[PDB]
Amino acid sequence: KTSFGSLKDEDRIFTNLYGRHDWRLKGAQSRGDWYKTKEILLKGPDWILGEVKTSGLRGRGGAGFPTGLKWSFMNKPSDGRPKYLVVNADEGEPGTCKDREIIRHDPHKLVEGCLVGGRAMGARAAYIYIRGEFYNEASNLQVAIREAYEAGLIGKNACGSGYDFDVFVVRGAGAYICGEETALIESIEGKQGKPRLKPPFPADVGVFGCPTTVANVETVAVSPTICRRGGAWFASFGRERNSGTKLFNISGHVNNPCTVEEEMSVPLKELIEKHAGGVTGGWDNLLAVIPGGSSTPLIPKSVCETVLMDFDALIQAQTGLGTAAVIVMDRSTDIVKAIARLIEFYKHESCGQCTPCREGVDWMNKVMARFVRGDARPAEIDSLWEISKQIEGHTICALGDGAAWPVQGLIRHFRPELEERMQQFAQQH
Amino acid sequence: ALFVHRDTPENNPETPFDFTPENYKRIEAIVKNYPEGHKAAAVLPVLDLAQRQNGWLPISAMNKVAEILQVPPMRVYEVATFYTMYNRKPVGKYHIQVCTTTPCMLRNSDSILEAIQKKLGIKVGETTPDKLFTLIEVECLGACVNAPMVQINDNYYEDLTPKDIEEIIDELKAGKIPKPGPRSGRFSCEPAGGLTSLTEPPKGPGFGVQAGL
Amino acid sequence: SGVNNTKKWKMEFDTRERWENPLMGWASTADPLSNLVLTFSTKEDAVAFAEKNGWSYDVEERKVPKPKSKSYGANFSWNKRTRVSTK
Numbered sequence: 001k002t003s004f005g006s007l008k009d010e011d012r013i014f015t016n017l018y019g020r021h022d023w024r025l026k027g028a029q030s031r032g033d034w035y036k037t038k039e040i041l042l043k044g045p046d047w048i049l050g051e052v053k054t055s056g057l058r059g060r061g062g063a064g065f066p067t068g069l070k071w072s073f074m075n076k077p078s079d080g081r082p083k084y085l086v087v088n089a090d091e092g093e094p095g096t097c098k099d100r101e102i103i104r105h106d107p108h109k110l111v112e113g114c115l116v117g118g119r120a121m122g123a124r125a126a127y128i129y130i131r132g133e134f135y136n137e138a139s140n141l142q143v144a145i146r147e148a149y150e151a152g153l154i155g156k157n158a159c160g161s162g163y164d165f166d167v168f169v170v171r172g173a174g175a176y177i178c179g180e181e182t183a184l185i186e187s188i189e190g191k192q193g194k195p196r197l198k199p200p201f202p203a204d205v206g207v208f209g210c211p212t213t214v215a216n217v218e219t220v221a222v223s224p225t226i227c228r229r230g231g232a233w234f235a236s237f238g239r240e241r242n243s244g245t246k247l248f249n250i251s252g253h254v255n256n257p258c259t260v261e262e263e264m265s266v267p268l269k270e271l272i273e274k275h276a277g278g279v280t281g282g283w284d285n286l287l288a289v290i291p292g293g294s295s296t297p298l299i300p301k302s303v304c305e306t307v308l309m310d311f312d313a314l315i316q317a318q319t320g321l322g323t324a325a326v327i328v329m330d331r332s333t334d335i336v337k338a339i340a341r342l343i344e345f346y347k348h349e350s351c352g353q354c355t356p357c358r359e360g361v362d363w364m365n366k367v368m369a370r371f372v373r374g375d376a377r378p379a380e381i382d383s384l385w386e387i388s389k390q391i392e393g394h395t396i397c398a399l400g401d402g403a404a405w406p407v408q409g410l411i412r413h414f415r416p417e418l419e420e421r422m423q424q425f426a427q428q429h
Numbered sequence: 430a431l432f433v434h435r436d437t438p439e440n441n442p443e444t445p446f447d448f449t450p451e452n453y454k455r456i457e458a459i460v461k462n463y464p465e466g467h468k469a470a471a472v473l474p475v476l477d478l479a480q481r482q483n484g485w486l487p488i489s490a491m492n493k494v495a496e497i498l499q500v501p502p503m504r505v506y507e508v509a510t511f512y513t514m515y516n517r518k519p520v521g522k523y524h525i526q527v528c529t530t531t532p533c534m535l536r537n538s539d540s541i542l543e544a545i546q547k548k549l550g551i552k553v554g555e556t557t558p559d560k561l562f563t564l565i566e567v568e569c570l571g572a573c574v575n576a577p578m579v580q581i582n583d584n585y586y587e588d589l590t591p592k593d594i595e596e597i598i599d600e601l602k603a604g605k606i607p608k609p610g611p612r613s614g615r616f617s618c619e620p621a622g623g624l625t626s627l628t629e630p631p632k633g634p635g636f637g638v639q640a641g642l
Numbered sequence: 643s644g645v646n647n648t649k650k651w652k653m654e655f656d657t658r659e660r661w662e663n664p665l666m667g668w669a670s671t672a673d674p675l676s677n678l679v680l681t682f683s684t685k686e687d688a689v690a691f692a693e694k695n696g697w698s699y700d701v702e703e704r705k706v707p708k709p710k711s712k713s714y715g716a717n718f719s720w721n722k723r724t725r726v727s728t729k
């Protein structure tokens with residue numbers, strides 16, 4: 001294969017993405033959910049982990065780590081502590097709204113994924129951490145969980161397999177940092193959402209100090225279908241090491257902003273015009289695209305022409321797939337103001353635990369505010385670049401990196417705009 | 430917003446607060462979700478329940494949550510001041526929360542914010558003198574493809590225009606509650622002007638199941 | 643927290659009277675050794691120097707911080723009291 005991105009409906013996983021069919025148990029079963037769940041559970045964790053591995057699935061939460069290998073850290077003899085699966089539904093990355101649709105329109109896929117993924121890990125229960133703003137979405141998930149409990153699909157003797165499994169829903173209280181896996185765990189434990197240093201890794205010491213795996217909603221929700229249809233089916237989509245289908249969010253300056261499922265490695269231009277109805281004002285009006293949520297560096301129009309949407313392709317473009325949330329900016333956008341607002345976002349979300357982000361991100365925010373008005377000198381651009389490199393790789397968690405990268409992207413591709421603004425301000429003062 | 434507490438007549442340790450008997454039943458179910466020996470895990474949900482009953486959190490509410498769960502009061506103050514959804518001072522009946530991050534900013538969230546300020550006659554961060562509405566800005570609310578949008582209490586209102594947000598305020602001001610969701614014509618997150626995928630009937634149980642299962 | 647000043651051995655002498663100068667209130671002294679501090683690489687060097695100079699001396703053994711057992715993971719213990727309530 002050389003071309004990707006004409007996914008057929010029969011190959012789509014989230015078939016109620018738009019909520020046009022009954023999201024409840026009766027509709028979910030009619031669409032293939034919960035089918036032969038007992039057989040999957042009886043195959044054993046090694047078979048389930050084997051399927052997840054051969055599918056080439058990678059983390060859909062933004063970091064893209066191989067799921068099969070990650071989940072295998074939990075396949076070990078019990079040492080007396082309970083084992084837990086924590087499903088990350090915090091969905092805080094600006095531009096990203098995919099996990100919201102799964103939770104409210106395909107909740108039973110997430111619940112079944114919790115049971116199947118939990119079985120492979122040997123977990124006794126799944127804690128679903130959903131952000132507190134998603135109140136109606138959380139209630140839908142709770143309604144679905146009650147339906148599954150009453151049909152015996154979860155709880156004692158889940159699906160008749162003799163495996164006891166509970167699914168808990170825990171709501172956040174308004175913190176983007178609580179999407180970070182260790183901050184999420186600390187939040188579940190009743191503390192501030194401040195990340196943990198590693199080691200220990202969560203698979204050894206996690207929620208309540210117990211072996212734990214944190215998985216994104218989308219990563220979990222697809223696992224039952226990978227088991228039913230097989231890893232080879234999943235691995236037949238997208239490039240090698242970039243397998244499967246993916247939920248994309250196309251927001252910003254597009255004619256029809258939308259969420260859609262498409263194959264991995266589809267061209268970015270193909271995605272924006274086939275599904276979102278093209279760029280506002282046409283493709284020639286495109287200025288820049290943030291390809292994977294606010295934490296991934298922007299790329300200009302030239303790069304957008306032929307870049308594919310997968311982990312490897314976007315890395316070579318000096319960015320990343322991230323959450324696959326595409327934010328589109330046309331030529332009428334104040335690009336400096338757009339990025340400054342993201343830095344302001346990271347300033348408001350930093351937990352404040354560690355020095356480079358507590359002080360550095362707030363510092364970068366102040367510099368960006370002056371850059372928007374042009375009230376600076378060109379020498380400060382290289383200073384700002386150097387400051388961002390002192391944050392990246394020196395913080396406890398990746399929020400520090402996620403604040404540096406947007407700044408680096410702007411300087412990389414839009415330095416003359418920054419310098420032009422400075423000239424205007426100096427000319428007028 | 431300040432992250433230190435100063436006692437006042439309206440908010441001090443002797444300010445009256447207790448959970449209703451029904452809310453004590455809900456607290457018991459919350460605490461049972463966690464392993465024995467780890468009751469501090471219930472601080473966030475129980476603290477939020479105290480806010481759902483009282484509307485906001487007086488220091489006496491924080492002290493009660495600490496007392497019930499047997500955690501030091503300071504550890505509850507830490508949570509209350511860390512998470513933005515906790516209201517540590519009174520808010521209006523309708524807490525309007527306008528997303529102004531870049532995906533929403535690109536689709537003209539400033540016009541929504543100006544429309545609300547003009548209608549209510551208040552600035553961002555203020556409460557109306559009638560104490561019906563409080564207005565603030567917030568970060569991404571996880572509905573970027575439906576920008577611009579606001580959240581009022583528990584409900585999202587999306588795909589907004591200045592006209593649309595004024596009607597919602599007029600309905601809340603008139604005692605009614607408007608329906609949540611997009612106001613542009615579409616139902617949720619599907620592309621406008623017709624679906625581009627999921628146009629065929631979904632397959633049934635057992636479709637594409639691998640052999641040997 | 644720096645430990646660089648705890649590397650060498652020292653020799654000081656017994657503290658003697660200081661009084662207030664009547665004119666200014668400055669601290670006066672009659673002890674010519676009041677500021678004498680000597681440095682030595684080892685305890686034996688210091689003791690040898692005191693002995694040949696005829697000074698009666700007291701030696702106090704070097705206090706070394708005991709090696710500790712540290713573990714960041716212990717902050718999140720499942721069943722032990724080492725679990726921290728805040729970060």
Ligand SMILES: Cc1cc2nc3c(=O)[nH]c(=O)nc-3n(C[C@H](O)[C@H](O)[C@H](O)COP(=O)(O)O)c2cc1C
Pocket residue numbers: 058059060061062063064065067070088089090091092093176177178179180181182214215216217219220397398399402
């Ligand atoms: C600031 C920050 C916010 C994050 N938010 C989320 C999130 O909302 N949802 C998510 O799945 N992962 C989020 N992550 C990534 C998680 O830490 C983690 O990598 C992921 O949940 C692992 O699950 P996965 O392997 O299925 O992707 C965030 C990371 C950081 C640093």
Ligand code: SF4
Pocket residue numbers: 177194195349350351352353354355357358395396397398399400
């Ligand atoms: S990088 Fe920022 S958010 Fe992450 S632990 Fe440090 S201060 Fe907290």
Ligand code: FES
Pocket residue numbers: 094095096528529530531532533534568569570571572573576578
């Ligand atoms: S940027 Fe407003 S909902 Fe995401």
